Amino acid sequence: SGFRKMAFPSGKVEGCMVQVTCGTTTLNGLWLDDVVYCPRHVICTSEDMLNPNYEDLLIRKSNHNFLVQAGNVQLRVIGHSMQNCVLKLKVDTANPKTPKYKFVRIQPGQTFSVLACYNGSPSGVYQCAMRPNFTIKGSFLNGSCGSVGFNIDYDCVSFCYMHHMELPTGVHAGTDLEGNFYGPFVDRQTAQAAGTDTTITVNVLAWLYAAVINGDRWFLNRFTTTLNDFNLVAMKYNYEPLTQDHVDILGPLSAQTGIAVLDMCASLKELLQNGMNGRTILGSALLEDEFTPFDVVRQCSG
Amino acid sequence: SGFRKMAFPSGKVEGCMVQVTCGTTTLNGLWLDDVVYCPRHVICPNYEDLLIRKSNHNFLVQAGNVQLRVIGHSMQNCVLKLKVDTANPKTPKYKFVRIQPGQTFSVLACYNGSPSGVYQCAMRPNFTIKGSFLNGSCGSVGFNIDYDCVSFCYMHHMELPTGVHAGTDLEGNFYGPFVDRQTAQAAGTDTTITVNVLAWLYAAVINGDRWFLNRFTTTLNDFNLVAMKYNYEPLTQDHVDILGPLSAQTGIAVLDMCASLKELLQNGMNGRTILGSALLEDEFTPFDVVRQCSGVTF
Numbered sequence: 001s002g003f004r005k006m007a008f009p010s011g012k013v014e015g016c017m018v019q020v021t022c023g024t025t026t027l028n029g030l031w032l033d034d035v036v037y038c039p040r041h042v043i044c045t046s047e048d049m050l051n052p053n054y055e056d057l058l059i060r061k062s063n064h065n066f067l068v069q070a071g072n073v074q075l076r077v078i079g080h081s082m083q084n085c086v087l088k089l090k091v092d093t094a095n096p097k098t099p100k101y102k103f104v105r106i107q108p109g110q111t112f113s114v115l116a117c118y119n120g121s122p123s124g125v126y127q128c129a130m131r132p133n134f135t136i137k138g139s140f141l142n143g144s145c146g147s148v149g150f151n152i153d154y155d156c157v158s159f160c161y162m163h164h165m166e167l168p169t170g171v172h173a174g175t176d177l178e179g180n181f182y183g184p185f186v187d188r189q190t191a192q193a194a195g196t197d198t199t200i201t202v203n204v205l206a207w208l209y210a211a212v213i214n215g216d217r218w219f220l221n222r223f224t225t226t227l228n229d230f231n232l233v234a235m236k237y238n239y240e241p242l243t244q245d246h247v248d249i250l251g252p253l254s255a256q257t258g259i260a261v262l263d264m265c266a267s268l269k270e271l272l273q274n275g276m277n278g279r280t281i282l283g284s285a286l287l288e289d290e291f292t293p294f295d296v297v298r299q300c301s302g
Numbered sequence: 303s304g305f306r307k308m309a310f311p312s313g314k315v316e317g318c319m320v321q322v323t324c325g326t327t328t329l330n331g332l333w334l335d336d337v338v339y340c341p342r343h344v345i346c347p348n349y350e351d352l353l354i355r356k357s358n359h360n361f362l363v364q365a366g367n368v369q370l371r372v373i374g375h376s377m378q379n380c381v382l383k384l385k386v387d388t389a390n391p392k393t394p395k396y397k398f399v400r401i402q403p404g405q406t407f408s409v410l411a412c413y414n415g416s417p418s419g420v421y422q423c424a425m426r427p428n429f430t431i432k433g434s435f436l437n438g439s440c441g442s443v444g445f446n447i448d449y450d451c452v453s454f455c456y457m458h459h460m461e462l463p464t465g466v467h468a469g470t471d472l473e474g475n476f477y478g479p480f481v482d483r484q485t486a487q488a489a490g491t492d493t494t495i496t497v498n499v500l501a502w503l504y505a506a507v508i509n510g511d512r513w514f515l516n517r518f519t520t521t522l523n524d525f526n527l528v529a530m531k532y533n534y535e536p537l538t539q540d541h542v543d544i545l546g547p548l549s550a551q552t553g554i555a556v557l558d559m560c561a562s563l564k565e566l567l568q569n570g571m572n573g574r575t576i577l578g579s580a581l582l583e584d585e586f587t588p589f590d591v592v593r594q595c596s597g598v599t600f
């Protein structure tokens with residue numbers, strides 16, 4: 001019993017965190033095999049950030065300009081290339097602590113763990129989701145750039161995020177491990193704003209199923225809804241449209257609890273209408289949207 | 303910017319998790335040097351009588367895909383200490399510490415000696431933890447990392463009928479009035495960790511949330527009279543002193559922040575949130591707020 005926002009054990013990722021320094025800039029890098037991956041803005045100063053020509057800044061750099069540090073050991077950079085917004089620093093030593101890994105690009109609504117690092121040193125781990133507006137509501141201070149987002153499925157670490165910037169609303173933008181940004185974001189200190197955020201509906205439904213599994217049924221009603229009428233109501237509360245894929249993905253949770261997805265949808269409709277009325281659901285006074293159907297099946301069952 | 307429930311990096315603890323099996327019972331063990339620590343209920347009650355019937359080879363210990371041979375066994379309160387032939391090479395710098403209610407720690411939840419998740423939680427004033435544990439999680443540990451040293455503070459033993467959890471420090475002493483026995487046990491009436499709510503209000507001010515602030519101040523006694531009415535833990539002078547650095551950083555005196563809390567308790571949030579929450583968060587200590595809003599690394 002119990003429902004917590006649970007991050008994956010960070011151990012496999014901790015053994016990959018290194019410090020990357022180029023001139024005065026110092027951020028984090030991910031050392032996997034003989035390659036260190038880090039945000040390409042490590043080559044930039046604060047001046048360069050307005051309109052940086054990365055190919056032009058990188059062509060002026062040699063291998064020895066990049067000081068890489070794994071613990072108390074300096075790694076020798078033997079090569080460097082750029083893949084989108086990530087810099088790939090070829091080093092002379094392969095990381096002995098390299099785990100089984102994959103680079104995965106996630107879709108909005110997907111959750112992952114973030115190992116927040118400063119100066120190549122892991123300082124904390126937390127769980128978060130890719131918001132529908134392609135930002136993450138993270139906890140990052142200056143020097144956290146290069147901190148990574150990951151999921152561990154079995155023994156394999158699936159890297160899905162590298163931190164690059166904080167938007168003016170305090171939310172964060174980053175890339176996948178191939179340098180492609182999530183969202184219309186760019187690694188430039190230009191006028192960029194996070195789009196209007198929406199609630200991840202499939203996740204709220206999944207979290208309501210977790211509450212039913214944990215014995216909380218106060219929010220259930222005798223009503224059902226059509227997918228279209230639910231989306232008409234959901235859109236008015238800035239909820240993401242629930243698609244037929246979301247309904248299919250919720251199938252196992254619906255079967256386990258005996259509450260049809262559209263029946264749970266009607267509870268959500270009523271919850272949006274009435275609020276909680278001094279009540280909580282899984283110790284929360286707000287509808288939680290940062291637990292996927294897979295997270296619920298993982299934590300409530302296995 | 304950003305405020306999340308943040309756990310310590312679990313890596314140093316992951317390298318200590320082993321599987322302990324005695325008969326049909328299977329749970330987790332903490333392998334530190336040549337000893338494996340685990341709940342004494344793995345033998346299951348008269349624990350001296352059940353343990354005297356066990357030999358070393360009855361305890362199957364598994365570190366990954368390697369079986370460890372138990373060469374000895376002793377009991378320290380509610381914890382079983384299984385002496386193994388091999389010292390854990392991944393043993394970190396560590397201490398066994400007993401924590402006080404209100405203090406927080408990270409829990410590395412494990413099943414069959416395999417870490418599956420990490421979360422932050424606080425020792426509730428009623429000595430239970432609002433954790434997330436399924437069957438097979440017994441032996442999962444609570445810890446804080448101070449610089450390079452892992453301070454083990456909790457070993458999970460059981461779940462109470464309200465879904466909350468009970469366990470011991472790493473010396474086998476239970477937190478709270480619990481016993482490792484299938485009997486009528488209930489968690490006492492819980493209270494809100496006041497110093498933690500105040501610390502979390504300071505974190506909201508650091509993150510640019512000032513809607514709840516007012517021009518008012520209060521005396522410690524008047525705040526305690528109000529707090530005791532809402533099942534809040536009494537705020538002591540030590541709490542006031544501990545919140546000093548946050549009071550200096552934000553320019554809001556502790557009794558000034560207490561007046562904000564008093565108004566939130568009597569009036570509510572009014573459709574507003576603080577750090578994305580509609581409830582007053584009490585599972586962040588003043589140190590957690592300082593550590594997260596400074597960037598302390600391990």
Ligand SMILES: O=C(C[C@@]1(C(=O)Nc2cncc3ccccc23)CCOc2ccc(Cl)cc21)N1CCC[C@@H]1Cn1ccnc1
Pocket residue numbers: 024025026027041042044045046049140141142143144145164165166167186187188189190303
């Ligand atoms: O500019 C940036 C980083 C930046 C950014 O967002 N940083 C931060 C990240 N995470 C959390 C943060 C919390 C508090 C303050 C800053 C944070 C600044 C704002 O403008 C942008 C715009 C775009 C991008 Cl991709 C990056 C940034 N850096 C980081 C190194 C190199 C370079 C120039 N540089 C040098 C020395 N300090 C900064």
Ligand SMILES: [Cl-]
Pocket residue numbers: 105106107110
């Ligand atoms: Cl995905």
